[PDB]
Every structure is written in C-alpha cells, then in structure tokens.
Amino acid sequence: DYYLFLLRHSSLYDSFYYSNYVNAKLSLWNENGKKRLHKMFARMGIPLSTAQETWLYMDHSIKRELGIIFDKNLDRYGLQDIIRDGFVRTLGYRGSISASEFVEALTALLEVGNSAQKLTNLRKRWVSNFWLSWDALDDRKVELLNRGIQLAQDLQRAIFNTGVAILEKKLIKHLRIYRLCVLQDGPDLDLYRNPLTLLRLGNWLIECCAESEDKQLLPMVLASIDENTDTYLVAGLTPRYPRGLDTIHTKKPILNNFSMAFQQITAETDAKVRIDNFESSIIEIRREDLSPFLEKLTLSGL
Amino acid sequence: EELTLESLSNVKANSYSEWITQPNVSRTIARELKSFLLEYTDETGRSVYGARIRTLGEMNSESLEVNYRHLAESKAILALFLAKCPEEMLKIFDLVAMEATELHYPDYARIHSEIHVRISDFPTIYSLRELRESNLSSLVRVTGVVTRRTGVFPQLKYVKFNCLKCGSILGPFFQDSNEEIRISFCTNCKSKGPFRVNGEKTVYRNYQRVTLQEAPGTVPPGRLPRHREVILLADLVDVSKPGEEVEVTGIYKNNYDGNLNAKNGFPVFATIIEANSIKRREGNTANEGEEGLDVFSWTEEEEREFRKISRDRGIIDKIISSMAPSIYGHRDIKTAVACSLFGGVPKNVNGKHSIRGDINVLLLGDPGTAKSQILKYVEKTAHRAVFATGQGASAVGLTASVRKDPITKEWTLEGGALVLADKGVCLIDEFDKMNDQDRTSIHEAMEQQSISISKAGIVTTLQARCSIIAAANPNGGRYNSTLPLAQNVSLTEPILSRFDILCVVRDLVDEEADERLATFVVDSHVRSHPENLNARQRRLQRQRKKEEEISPIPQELLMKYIHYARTKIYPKLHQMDMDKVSRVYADLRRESISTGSFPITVRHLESILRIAESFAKMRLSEFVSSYDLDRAIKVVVDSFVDAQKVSVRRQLRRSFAIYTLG
Amino acid sequence: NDDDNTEIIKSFKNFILEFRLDSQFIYRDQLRNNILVKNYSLTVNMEHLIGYNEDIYKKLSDEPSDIIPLFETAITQVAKRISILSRAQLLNSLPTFQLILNSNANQIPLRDLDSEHVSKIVRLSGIIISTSVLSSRATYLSIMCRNCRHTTSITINNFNSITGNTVSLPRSCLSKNCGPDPYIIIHESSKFIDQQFLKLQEIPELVPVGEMPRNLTMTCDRYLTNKVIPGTRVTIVGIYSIYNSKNGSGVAIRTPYIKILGIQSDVETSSISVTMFTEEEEEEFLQLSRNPKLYEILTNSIAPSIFGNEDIKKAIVCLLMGGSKKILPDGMRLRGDINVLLLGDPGTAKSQLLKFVEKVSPIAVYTSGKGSSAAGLTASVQRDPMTREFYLEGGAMVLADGGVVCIDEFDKMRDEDRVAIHEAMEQQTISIAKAGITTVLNSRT
DNA sequence: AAAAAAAAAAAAAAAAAAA
DNA sequence: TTTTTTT
Ligand SMILES: Nc1ncnc2c1ncn2[C@@H]1O[C@H](COP(=O)(O)OP(=O)(O)OP(=O)(O)O)[C@@H](O)[C@H]1O
Ligand SMILES: Nc1ncnc2c1ncn2[C@@H]1O[C@H](COP(=O)(O)OP(=O)(O)OP(=O)(O)O)[C@@H](O)[C@H]1O
Ligand SMILES: [Mg+2]
Ligand SMILES: [Zn+2]
C-alpha cells in the first residue's frame, strides 16, 4: 500500500494530487508542481483520460502492472518512500478496504456529521458525532462508511484550498524562535472550530515546511477566529523530521513545551483564557488579549 | 554504404519518387533527419525541438510542428525533396519522429502509436485561381473561406480480408482516403472469387471533408469564387469552423470520376486537397510579427519571462502606456480598453446563480478623436475579434439565424456574428446610427450571455461570452457640455445601464496641447517611412529598434502575455473593504438621477468588482490587493464625474475626493 | 465453439443463483417479483458483477455484442427453472428476457467520442429532442418453401456485430432441385418486438468555444421504449457502434449510432398521469405538508440569492402550484392556471427569477420574445424530404404543455407575433388550418 | 431500375412609402 | 428623418 489519499476509492490522479507527502515533495500548490506531475504521468505511460477514472473501472492490465510501473518510474522524482506494506480486509463479495482508508473515514466522520450556550452546544454535538462514529464500526452498516469516505474527500479538498491560499499570501511570519501564522480572514472558517481539523491543517503545513531547504526546526503556533464568540483558538505544533530519515538521528522525539508555557503565562498574568482541553497544547484566548499574550510568550523562556 | 549527405545531390533514377524509396537512400535520409531534429540549435543555443517534445509529452497531443525555414537553412536538399515529393518524405519523417519521441518518453506507445507531423509555413503561396498542371503531387498553400463542413465519420486504416473460396487471409492493407482497395488475383492461389472483410481485427481513423471558397477580399472585384474540396484526416478534425477565413498547407492530388467525364465529353479529372496543416487567419491580418501555426501560443521560456516581468513595480503603468504607441493622450481610454480586454472572472454560485464576468465599454465624443484607430488596434489585439459597422449589420446577422439546408432539405441554425465573438470581443462602429431594430437584439448577449432561438420548430439556446466595445457620435456632431447626458444621445436607460466604463472625449481649443500633438503626429509620419548576417534578422532588428522608441515592450510578447493571462490566472477576492464600497455605492445612488440624469444601478457594483479583478489579473496574481481596488474605484468615480454639466463638475469632484484619497 | 458458450452461460447462471448479501438472494427475488407482475426484465448492477468475479466483467468489457445474448438467455433459463414445474416431463410464453445495466463510470461527453470507442460500453448524458414512432422487428420467423414446400423456423437475435449480421435466406433447399432461395416469410405464427429511435443533443454548458451543438442517434427496444419525452435531461448507458450506408459521399463511410441499454431520468416519467411514489417518500411529503409554516419555508427557498422581493416570490409559488381544472355538464371548460406579468424598471433582476423558475418547474422552456415568431411557437407545417407529404410539427409552447413557459422581453416581439397567443392562453387549444390539415390541438400551460 | 417534383410554409433583406 | 411593409 502507498501513502495515498483514498487510493481504492478515488481516481489515481486525484490521489497523487491530494496526497500530502507528494504535495510536500513536489510543491503542487504552484504551476511547476502540476507540470512535474504531468511529466511523471506521461513517463509512466498512463493516459490522462485513463488516470482520471474510478479505481473499479480503471484498466485491469495496468492495475496489475501498477507495482512494476511505480518501481521503474518513481526513482527519478525520488518518491520511492511512498511504497509500504499494509493490511487489507475483505468480506465476501462486498469489496476491499485498507486500514489507512478506514481510519481517514473515521476521522472525517468525527470531524463532520449530522457564549457559554454556544460552547456547550458545540461540545455536545462533538459527543453526538463521536457516538455516530462508534455506531459506524460494526459490519452491518456501510452507509455510515461511504458517507465518511465522501466527507473525507471534501474535507481534504477544503484543507488544500485553504493551505494554498496561506502559502500564496505568505502569512507565515518567521520570528526569532518560533514561526507564527494567523487566519484573520478567509473562506470556510467555520470548519476550523474543531481541534482535530485544525491539527490536520497544521500537520499538512508542518509537512510542507519540513520539506524545504530550511535547516531550522522551530515550533509553530496557529490561530483561528469564530466571530460568534470573538475568540481565537490557538494550537501549538512541534517540528517533524523528514519521513525518509535514518533511525540514528531518532534518539528522542521532539517534545512539546507549549502546555507548560501556556500554564506559566496564565499563572503569572490574568488573561481571559480557558484551558480545558484534554490536549494541554490547545487553548482558547480572547481577540483583544491575543497580541500582548503572544508578546509574553516571545519574551518567556521556552 | 556511403551514407553521405552530398551523395543525394545527383539523382540516379529517372524521377524523385522512385529514388527516395530506394533502401540505401531511405536509411540515410532517416539518419540525417534524426541528426537534424536532435541537434538543431536556435539562437539561444538550445534545441527548440527538445522543448517541443517535452511540451507534447506534457499535453500528450498528436501533432509535432516543424518550422520549414529551419529545415531550409540546414540540409536544404531534404527541404527540396519534401517540397517535391511529400508522400514519400512524411512517412520516414513520422518514423523518425516516433523514434525521437520515445527517446525521451519510453513506453509512450501505450498512449499513441503514431504521430502526424505538421509543417509550419511553406515559402511560396498560391491562391485558388493560380492552380495549374505542374503543381500536382507536391505541397501547396491555399487561403480560403469555409462554407460547408460535412461531419465526423470513422474510417478503415488496416483492411484485411478472408477469401472463403480458398480460406486465405489477406495481409493488412492501407487506404488513400479517396480510393477503394481492389484486389484482382486474391493472393497465392491466383483465383478470383468472393471474400469478406472480417473487421473484428481492424483499427479506425476518422476524417472530415469541407468546402473551401476564395477569400472575398482576395477575389478580383465583380468576379466569382472557385470552390475546392479539402479532406481532413485524423487529429485535424473540427479544427475549422464555418464562416471563418483559414489558410491550409496540403497536398494536391487528382482522381478519376465518371459523371465529370460524362458531362464534358473529355477525359477530365477531379482534384481534392489532403490537409496537412491549418492556420486560422480571421481578423488578425497582421501576419508579419512571427511565424508558426499559432501566434497566441507560448513556449516555456516565454512563460518564464512572463513570470519574471509580471512582478516589477508599476507594471500596470507600462502595460497601459504600451497600448497603441502611435496615439497621443487619451490615458483613460488606454486604461479602459485594457480593462475591457482582460475581463473578469465569471461567477457560478451553487450552479443556480450566474454572474457575468466581462466588461462592456462605450466611447462618445466629437469627430477626429481617433476612436476608429483604437477599435482597429483592439481588433488586431484580441484572440477573437469581430468587426461591424453602422447599417452594415442586421439584427439577425449578429445573432444566429435559421436557414434551410439546400441539400438535406430542412431547417438548420446558422452561426451569427456574436457566436464567433464567444471568448473574445465584438466591436461596433457608428453605434448611434444603427437602426434600433438592429440594436435591441443584443441585450441578452450583453447581460445574460445567452442566445435563445424559437423559430421554425427549433427551440435551442446557444452560449455567447462577448465583450462589446462601441463608438458613436452625439446629437449634432458635437458634444454640448452644458447639457446632461440624457439630451446628448438618443439611447435610453436599458441600453446605457449595461455599459460599465463610459468615456466621453471632448475636442477643445488649446495652444501647447496642439503644438505637442502636432509634433507627435509629424514624428509618427516620419517614423513610418518605408525608406528608413542574414538579411531577415537585420530587418527584424531594425524593426525592433523602430518599435522600442514608443512601446515599452514588444507587441508579440504582449499578445502572448494577453493569452496567458486570459487562460491561466484566476484572481480571488477575500480582503476587500465592505463599508468603503457600500458607502460609495450608496453615494452614487444618491445624486445621479435624483439630481442629474445618468442612471446608476446595482450592475455598476458588479462592474467595480470586475474591474478590480481585471487589475488583479494584470499582475498575474491569484488574490486581489487593496491597491487594485483603489484603482478600480478611482476609474469608476472619475468616469461618473466627467459625464456631468460644468456647473456641478467641480463641486462633485471635491465631494468625491475622500474615497480615492490615495 | 459451443463449449465456450456453455461455460459462459453456466458461469452467469451460477452468479445469478449464488450471489447473496447478508441473508438475501437479491436477484432471484427480483426475478420472482418481476415474473409475478409480467415485467420480463432483470437489472444488473456492475459493481456486483465486478465484485463477484473480475474475469466475467473483463469478457463483458471486451466483446459486449457477442456476450450479452448469452447472459440474456441464461436469465430466461433460470426463470423457467424457478417458475414452472417440470411435472415429470404447455404454454411456455416466456420470451428472451431483457437485460438492463447500471454503472457509475466516468461520464464521456458527446464530442469526445471518436474511433477508439467502437464496440465499447460507454456512459454519457444529453438532452432529448425528437422521438420516432414505434416499429416492429421479427425474432422468430416461420419460413416456407415453394417447390419442396417444407416448413422451417429462424430465430433472430437483435444484437449486431457486423453491419449485415443477417442470414437473409438459406442458399438452396433442405433435404429436389429447387431454385436459389425459394423461401417465403409466413407472417402468421411469428414473434415480433417493438423498437424506437431517439435523437440526442449536447448539454448546453459543455459546448466547446464557438461551436454549435451536435446530434446523435439512439435505438431502444422492448421495455425501454416510450420511457422519455423530448426536452428532458437523461443519462444513457449503451454501446457505441456503426452501420453501413449503401443508400447514401466519401469513401468507406459508416455512420455511428448508440444502442440503448440503460436509461436514468430526473423526472422518472412520473408526470408522464398516475402516482407511483413509494410509501417512504409519500410519508415524507405528508410530514412536510403537516408543517404549520411551510409557506414561509417555500417562500424563502425561491431564489435565495435574490434579496428583498416578497410578493413576487409569493406569486411565483402560487403560479407553480396552479389552480383547479373544472368541467361542466354542457361541455364548458374553465382554465386552471395563473399568468403573471413583470413590468418593472431596469436593474431589478426580473430575468434572474425567470431562469430560476425555468430550473425549478418540471416542464419549463426559456425563450426570448425577440427571437420568436408566431409560426415558431404554436405549430409548424413541414414536408418530408423524400415523400413530400405534409405533417405537423410542434413548436415551443406545445413542447411545454403541462408546465410553464418563460418569456422575457415581452414588448420587443412583433405585433403580428403577439396576437397568436390570445386563444392559446384564453382557451388552451390551438387550431391549425393549413394545406388541408385541420386539427384542434390542446396546450395547457 | 429509380420516384425528382409542382405546390405550399416559413424566414429574411432591400426598397419604398407614410408619418 | 424614421419605421413600417412589401418583394
Ligand atoms: N493623438 C491623436 N489624436 C487624434 N487623432 C490622431 C492622433 N494621432 C493621430 N491621429 C489621427 O487622427 C485621425 C483620427 O481618426 P479618424 O479620422 O479615422 O476618425 P476617428 O477620430 O477615429 O472617428 P470618426 O470616424 O468618428 O470621426 C486618424 O487618421 C489618426 O491617424
Ligand atoms: N435585489 C437584488 N439582489 C441581488 N442582486 C440583484 C438584485 N437586483 C438586481 N441584482 C443584480 O442585477 C444584476 C443584473 O440583473 P438583470 O440584468 O437580470 O436584471 P433585470 O431586471 O432582469 O434587467 P433587464 O430589465 O435589463 O432585462 C445581477 O447580476 C443581479 O445580481
Ligand atoms: Mg432581462
Ligand atoms: Zn487461394
């Protein structure tokens, strides 16, 4: 199996286009990325009309030969780290599924489904979505998995659409210690009220930042806005090494000090924050209180 | 085997055709052609054909284009061979093209097995009248107008037969697209009998034949045109459209006919043209800027230079100053025209709301203001240009019309003028004198972008994306400043409101302005005087020196820039001032008809948005910035201000100074 | 040669009789219910076919016309097996069962069809413009000779691989010294099926730049006939094949056409005069109708992007619902529709409502008052190219009978064209007296 | 081997006419 | 001068 977004349920072209690893490796958010992708497809020899068909109806001979095609072509672009070994579950004549696809469907179903009062309503719809995902586990239901798969497609599309805008506008400010970016205004901001969706976006962003010529591993701070509450949701993200790296430089995983920094600043100053997430690296802050708080975080020992 | 190029100079057989097919000759020709297209260095020191192959691989199309003069400058004997014997040359050249292409893309054969090489521009040009006996079985270059297009049908490429009287399977056979394969002795048995086609193992092509007349601007006056038939093989299908002027490079061939010999009493033969390359020549008659099948297409380095020069400061200033470098003044028009020919982004909300994304422009003023020259330059500039004038266009002419087919004997639709303008511009001269029945028919074309016909039992709806640029003259031949716009023209609100940018140009008496204009005009006349390495490149550099003194950038680069900007870049609009634009629109709703005469509606707000999007397009940016919004609002407010009476012009000008503060 | 056919038929029968989800054999139950209500047809979903086995799908993909008849006779074999008792050894009025497919492959537009799709299964969508009348086709022919005078039966399958595909008449007689083909067709004691022809036009918003829409021809037969009406968006699944043109220009031409295998429609032929909705959908409609304020829900839902106008939206909803048709003992009719005219200033978005209203109503046509004529709306009299006989072809207002018509720029139309609609909207019946053709044709809109 | 065409209906452009 | 109607 390969690091591909819903390979067995979307066309191979869209799979390569939305796969985060290929995105990071070849910069598909501008034109040269698409040109290199088309060159790769041509050198493989799959037609652009063929590669844009569903995996079921796509040609059987090249379905069989896909492994050899990848082995012989991917070396030039250096994407050979996309091939791995995984698990596949088959139930009679129903079809085939894989662990990565199933967990992505579950994650998307958790994300999307169906002042204090609004916060309580959000926290209760989160539990409702959790129970819906739980019920989706059993093998007697598949209409709660097809919906999850299509919603995963939609969510990944929206995340890509927002990330291309971020990297185009160059909102990533490089401070002395830690990078910072704030989504002041844009599209589809209402989706990012979910911490897991925000983490997915941040994971893609940190992958993109890592897959560059920069040799600095800096923590990242990301913020959002919901005009209904007039609050900023802030999450701290750790740097990540390139996936294709040896294990010798893996003595200790990169730690996360953001929870300690947040608790120390909240203890020493009377900010209007609300630290109640089980993930201690995610806090809520006020719009007027954000900027001085950030200053403090800059001036504090990390 | 002496595989030397010089040995091809002297022929050993009686004719060229029987000498080319010689086994010794063919392989030498193939290897020389290979060494040509693998190594031909352009002026930049890089093989242009390498870039051509890369682009073809990216686009996985079915046509590789070879410049003729490139082949002429090096290995000219092969150019002569191709000019005299096309059939025996093109096959070998296709084979070497496949070899070269799979040198870059191995296993590309799964995409396509063969290629159809096209020649760019032959040196000699013939018209339909100057066709003789000698120019047969050789390349010709014919200009014409398409009249009747047949359609798309499949063909047989590799024909095989099964002879059942002996059970003999015949080998694959070709076809020449105007004959029938006739087999006499039926393979080794040497016996005549029945056989079947058994086309379960066969491969298909598709062709399309069309009627080619003479260009009405080329025929001698008061004479009649000469028709010919053109057959279009695979990959050239539907490239040509009815009603357009085209130029075709092809092969002239002859064939026998029965009824032709019947009606004349003499052994006369029919002739058809097998198309080999097609180049559109509608509107854009300036055919000296560059060569090639398509002048609006770009190479990769041209895209790189587009990106490089799209980022410098004040690029909009250079672009606006680089349009019509032979007309003095009229900065506002020089800006409105650019904003009109870039256009906006069409908007589709949920598939149930449609917002037009193109800008109309109207000009108005006294005679002698060079409006027609601007219109001519616009026609020369855009990718799709349609020119009309005054009484010379009827309402049913601009729009599609219902016609009865004189052969198939029923009704059918005929493409109107606006249909050719789809994805392009339609230019109207003398807008005011056109009869109102000929004027009211384009409301949907301006606004809804749709054409609907319910005539003679046919109920269909077409599609038209056209930007209308019009010019006219006010009542009495001169614009009276002390009257509102309602008493200066005969148009009404419904037609006026559809126009986004409306410019009024006045003729006024001045001293130093007249002196400067006269100096510029005289220097322009003395500049364009016909009497002031390879000769052609020295001519080209002289032309470049002549052009660089008034235009900041060369025009062919500008045309390719226009095409690139219209094709790829799509701006997006996020960070715009809600209250600023809302207050501006409220202010324009105030005053206006409530104090004056000019009508203002919600469509002008969409016009402001579209102008801002166009300004964003000018810089090859995906996101609108605030400066572009400022420029758009400045243009709109200025256009509204300078269309009022002189009694209130200064007062309104000082009133509106806060939104365009800058 | 026969062994391959037997193996293929056996494999298809095994698939039919062995496929099951959870605790249900879906296709066997489908066959039983179909036979009970005299709908001799079966529907195969391609995903199930692929999942059960891939080699059978490969064989169906390679040669459709050669393979389909084997499946459509295996179906009738299974039906005879599971519907009729052998009674240790009758009517047997079971013809060959019709096979209908459904799939979810990538759509291919009309203009992208080329020589590489010959004899392949493709999926496409368009708009229906013209429908031919029904016609008969023979499937079982009784053949009698003249000299030897013996009887024979010929079985005809309706699938064509080559252009001919037809054994006209056997050469010589069956065994003295007869002629070449001394056979005649016994019209009595034969079996006939029904066939219809349709025309497809390209979808408006996929037309390439500066082009005119292209037409294509389709053939449907048996139950697929009389399912669509002109002017309804459809999705077709079938085979793209060719037929020779001897009666026709060019060399080796072969006009292409489409053989319909499956049709999906947006209206599901529901209005084409009884109700056939399932209980779930009817219950849902009743539940929505039970809402105490659904009037405001519908009023808001009319053109959500248009702001401010309220009475016009209420009037549009009232028009969409329509009145109540009436009749009387003495024959007097009473109109059952309402006609709304918008007469307003520019810039108020009048037509933006017209195209949305065209989108909502199940039967709607949009046309401009400038590009219209009296003869081009009510009824047009043509004459055939070949037989010259005059016939009546309807225009626009009759094409949208039983729905609503969207006219914009009502003033720009000529005075002569604005008088023909008087009776057409006051009495809903248009009368034509041209070339000896007298006809009272109805139009309710 | 050949029925093939006079009679209608509908769609324009030009010119002249009336207001 | 303009729009209408007829050829
Ligand atoms: N700066 C200029 N401003 C105006 N005219 C200029 C200028 N420079 C040159 N000209 C000349 O003035 C003439 C104006 O064009 P032309 O006489 O064809 O009519 P127009 O002004 O376009 O419009 P109209 O036909 O309505 O009178 C052209 O011959 C053009 O070459
Ligand atoms: N109330 C409104 N809300 C939103 N948009 C509006 C409204 N009124 C007009 N518009 C805008 O007007 C624009 C053009 O409208 P449109 O041309 O359809 O108007 P109309 O009244 O039908 O005009 P016409 O009488 O000239 O045919 C649209 O882009 C639409 O967004
Ligand atoms: Mg309108
Ligand atoms: Zn033989």
Ligand SMILES: [Zn+2]
């Ligand atoms: Zn007999």
